[PDB]
Structure 1
């Protein structure tokens, strides 16, 4: 399938959709890491994720997705699924393992808390949102069970951040891709959407505020909301 004429890969291209309250919780993740590391990148606002050309990039037909030049320039590489976009950026650009982890010990914990989000909170939150808003029929027993599972996940994150000196989910000293992956689903605005009082997880709330005060995180949230609302609506932004 032929790509749009304005889609060229001279650097990392992050594929997003038009910014809304419900369209940015996955796409913000790679953008945060790009902002943290100062990686050169373009933004491509996808009008239709069902477009055949886009399914050749991401067969799951969702944002975020990435096209980038391989380090030696011989291939065009792709990343899709938000956790995979974080892994790719860390692999290609986080030379020092500042967010990816510097040694086997660091990476063992990072991958525990990253995968916990990827396998448990992420999909539980997505299934809650699907059955709450998108499913033609309302299934209240299923929705209540998923909401219950979210409280159990918040309990695990709270327990972790109550451990001595544990300022971040994976490492004590600094945020990692585990923290970036978790933040959008573990912050006050998301908790209130789920019908939960975030104050009931005080160390988790403190952690979300600490993450939120980072300049890269602030820039990421601002830009993801703005995409498609500038001079250009769809395609490669300038």
Structure 2
């Protein structure tokens, strides 16, 4: 019913973010939302109560997962999939102000930003999730599965590390380094919520990925980021 009444009286403006206090993809969206100055409220869904199975929610997000965002100012447009939401945001912020904050107005740069973005949503997140699953939630213990995904997650972090190290190397010919166009974009941010959980599968970023550590730290010091991870 909680979800019901809300869809009975939705704000004519602003944004509503459906998330979960455990969903990194949710906090990922909160961060961007916060960095762009977008005012919004969060509705943490109780999966225990099966609220994510509520008809009103499946309408918003047919995949019945989080995050899902509602752009009220746009006739209550519903955007699901964190990657889709990030793009909708940087695009909307750009057409409105003329400044491609956390984005780019150059086609080539966007292709670069998207690459890291899809890589994060397609190869980073799913893997951390499969690792966590066998390590902690499977119906039985399967060391080989845990090792498969743990390795993979290490492999993907190696690509990011190597990339960051490469960017640093280039500028030499603890200064902050970024994935695309020497500027903070949604590319860098997408990884932040996750970097904070991989410890749970035995990965020690600070130690095994020095570049990723500095990187995450620079981002962890931004007001908007802190605000999001607290809300």
TM-score bin, normalised by smaller chain: 0.7 to 0.9
Matched, 1:184 2:193: yes
Bigger relative contact order, structure 1 or 2 (CA pairs below 8 A, ≥6 apart): 1
Is the 1:15–1:43 Cα contact (8 Å) retained in structure 2? yes
Match of 1:34? Answer: 33
Rounded Cα–Cα distance in structure 1 between residues aligned with 2:181 and 2:220: 17
Rounded Cα–Cα distance in structure 2 between residues aligned with 1:40 and 1:91: 16
Instruction: Please point out which of 196, 203, 208 is paired with 1:196.
Output: 203
Is the 2:35–2:224 Cα contact (8 Å) retained in structure 1? yes
Is the 1:98–1:176 Cα contact (8 Å) retained in structure 2? yes
Rounded Cα–Cα distance in structure 1 between residues aligned with 2:53 and 2:94: 32
Matched, 1:171 2:181: yes
Tell me the TM-score normalised to structure 2 length.
Answer: 0.85
Is the 1:16–1:45 Cα contact (8 Å) retained in structure 2? yes
Match of 2:87? Answer: 87
Instruction: Give RMSD over aligned pairs.
Output: 2.0
Structure 2: stretches of 5+ with no match in the other structure: none
Tell me the TM-score normalised to structure 1 length.
Answer: 0.82
For residue 222 of structure 1, report the CA deviation from its aligned partner.
0.7
Query: Of Structure 1 and Structure 2, which has the larger fraction of its residues in helix?
Result: 2
Structure 1: stretches of 5+ with no match in the other structure: 224-238
